[PDB]
Chain A
Amino acid sequence: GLPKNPDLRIAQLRFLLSLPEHRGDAAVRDELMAAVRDNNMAPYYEALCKSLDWQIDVDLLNKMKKANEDELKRLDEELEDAEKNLGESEIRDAMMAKAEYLCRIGDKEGALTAFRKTYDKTVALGHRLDIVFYLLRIGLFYMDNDLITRNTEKAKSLIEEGGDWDRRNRLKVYQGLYCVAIRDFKQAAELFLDTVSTFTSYELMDYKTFVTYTVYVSMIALERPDLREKVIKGAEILEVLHSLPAVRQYLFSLYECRYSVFFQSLAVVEQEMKKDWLFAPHYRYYVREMRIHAYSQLLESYRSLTLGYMAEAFGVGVEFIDQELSRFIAAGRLHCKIDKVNEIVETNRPDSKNWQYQETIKKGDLLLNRVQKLSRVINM
């Protein structure tokens, strides 16, 4: 529905180029250069050249600059014609076209100011929503946290005043993408599960990419019952996963307690996640949380198990499983303790009463601190 400008594939390719092991890659360079030359994207060409210390082609750069200049002159001429002869609708459309071209040619600040001016002149609620969505897309393209937050708030408010279900679903997809960008995986899983059945924001990513993101985030966020009900038994999710054997194996290995295959698939998923432009900083966190999740899931069904049993189940050595278990217990993530003399992990899961008492102590301590502060404030 909405136009694919700006292309997030361009941002993904740029991030991949910025990566060390893919900095020397050529196919990424070829695809990015083809996209730029199909789009005549000069300012972003300069930005990429200065960020990556690239050798700028003077002929191509000059051709791009001349094309951009003549096109901008054309849009200005159409805007003047609409102002002189036509009503506010045609000048509005001309200004939207100018802003769209500015965003297309990779100008960030120019596109921002043009879209802001258009929004100032925009009256139709649907067109305000479209402009806000364009600003959100630009912010996602440049990973501008403040811009994304402000435009998300604006879109939410606009939809609350008047919101069609299509734009609300699209805003849900954008919010899920941003939540992924800020490691807020629970909300991202919520939104992706809500939008998987009616995903229409193809400008952000393909359906398969969205489904892979949904599977990953739901795995890291949902517990076992919710994961089984909404993801394992998900209709559309299973339908698309029929065409993604790797993601399907990764998802089903943990649910079926096939921990060695799960670990191998998690290594594959980490390798995929490192190259992703959006899941970039959270790959270590995601992997650590998945390892903790697998360890806790295995230990939930056992009171005391030999370290060799985990080594065989996860397909690793005794030393590696011991080191990871010790590190995660030291961080207070697993309810167990290790007997290295016998090499037996004994779970220390608190009973219902003990956990309830500890939660009561914590919550009551917080509430009593608040009460003491309030009383000392008011009693002078």
Chain B
Amino acid sequence: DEFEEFPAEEDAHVWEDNWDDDNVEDDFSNQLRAELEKHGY
């Protein structure tokens, strides 16, 4: 019972990727270094 009325119109990774993976940000080491030097002084 196919629905032919509606026409049926690289990154080949197997693991499930969560939305946060797409979010861009600096490395955690950089963030930790920045926070450490901010709170150090």
Residues of A within 8 A of B (CB): 145, 182-184, 263-264, 266-268, 270-271, 274, 281-282, 284-285, 287-288, 291, 311, 315-317, 320, 327, 331
Contact = CB atoms under 8 A, between A and B. Distances in A.
Given A316-B39, A317-B38, A331-B19, A182 B31 contact: no
Residue from A145, A263, A267 with most neighbouring chain B CB atoms (10 Å): A267
Interface of B is mostly: helix
Contact of B27 (A184, A270, A281): A270
Given A182-B14, A284-B21, A331-B20, A320 B28 contact: no
Contacts of A284: 21
Contact of A271 (B21, B29, B38): B29
Contacts of A287: 28
B15 A183 contact: yes
B35 interface: yes
B8 interface: no
Interface residues of B, number: 20
Contacts of B12: 145
A258 B19 CA distance: 29
B35 A184 contact: no
Contact of B18 (A266, A268, A331): A331
10 contacts: A182-B15, A263-B32, A267-B29, A267-B33, A271-B27, A274-B27, A285-B18, A311-B39, A331-B19, A331-B20
Nearest to A312: B39
A315 B20 contact: no
A296 to B, nearest CB: 15
Contacts of A266: 28
Nearest to A145: B14
B31 A320 contact: yes
Contact of B28 (A145, A183, A267, A281): A267
A320 B19 contact: no
Contact of A270 (B18, B21, B28): B28
B14 A315 contact: no
Given A267-B29, A281-B13, A285-B21, 11 more contacts: A266-B28, A271-B29, A284-B21, A311-B39, A315-B36, A316-B39, A317-B38, A317-B39, A320-B31, A331-B19, A331-B20
B20 A317 contact: no
A271 B32 CA distance: 12
Contacts of A281: 13
B13 A270 contact: no
Contacts of A183: 15-16
A301 B39 CA distance: 26
Nearest to A271: B29
B15 A316 contact: no
A320 B35 contact: yes
Nearest to A274: B27
B20 to A, nearest CB: 6
B32 A264 contact: yes
A216 to B, nearest CB: 15
Contact of A316 (B14, B18, B19, B32): B32
A284 B31 CA distance: 13
A315 B31 CA distance: 12
A285 B20 CA distance: 8
Q: Report the 4 A-B pairs with minimum CB-CB distance, sorted nearest first.
A: A183-B15, A267-B29, A267-B32, A316-B35
